[PDB]
Design a protein around this ligand. Structure first.
Ligand SMILES: Nc1ccc2oc(=O)ccc2c1
Length: 168
């Protein structure tokens, strides 16, 4: 469990790797994988869609049941559901969608949810269709998360920009 390999330590507790988060979950067998969720837990693309596809749609079926029973999450909020074949747990975290006018200050609230878990495999929050600057998202992660977070970034050019941002 939690067999993280080949990460670069950026801070006392934040690590980064140029990797596919689904292939990392399969290799590492983490206690927790973080999903970059939306408030209705509709896993239609990006990391959410990739995680769901790797679970053979189990995540989406579980999420649909959760939302019909319990209602939507809030921006900045989270829920813990099954990790299925990826992890023990999946922490579904909703970062703000600034492309849709939501407040970037809620990215702090989103990352605060990571402090309820000793170690996490995670993507950067509010990246991709959520529209936040990835360098800013890494900064908020570093400033907010105090537990051990292993970040997976798929795209090499973005990984390099983030690592350079950070150590040069
Ligand atoms: N001190 C240190 C630095 C980097 C690391 O990256 C890993 O993949 C596993 C543990 C680790 C420990």
């Amino acid at each position: 469990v939690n067999s993280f390999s080949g990460y670069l330590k950026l801070t006392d507790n934040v690590y980064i790797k140029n990797a596919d988060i689904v292939e990392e979950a399969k290799k590492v067998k983490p206690t927790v994988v973080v999903n970059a969720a939306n408030v209705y837990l509709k896993h239609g693309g990006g990391v959410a869609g990739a995680l769901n596809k790797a679970t053979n749609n189990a995540m989406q079926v579980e999420s649909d049941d959760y939302i019909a029973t319990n209602g939507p999450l809030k921006v900045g909020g989270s829920c813990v559901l099954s990790g299925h074949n990826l992890a023990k747990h999946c922490l579904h975290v909703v970062g703000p969608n600034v492309n849709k006018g939501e407040d970037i200050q809620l990215l702090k609230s989103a990352y605060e949810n990571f402090n309820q878990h000793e170690v996490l495999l995670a993507p950067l929050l509010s990246a991709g269709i959520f529209g936040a600057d990835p360098i800013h998202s890494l900064r908020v992660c570093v400033d907010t998360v105090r537990t051990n977070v292993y970040l997976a970034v798929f795209d090499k050019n973005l990984y390099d920009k983030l690592v350079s941002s950070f150590l040069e």
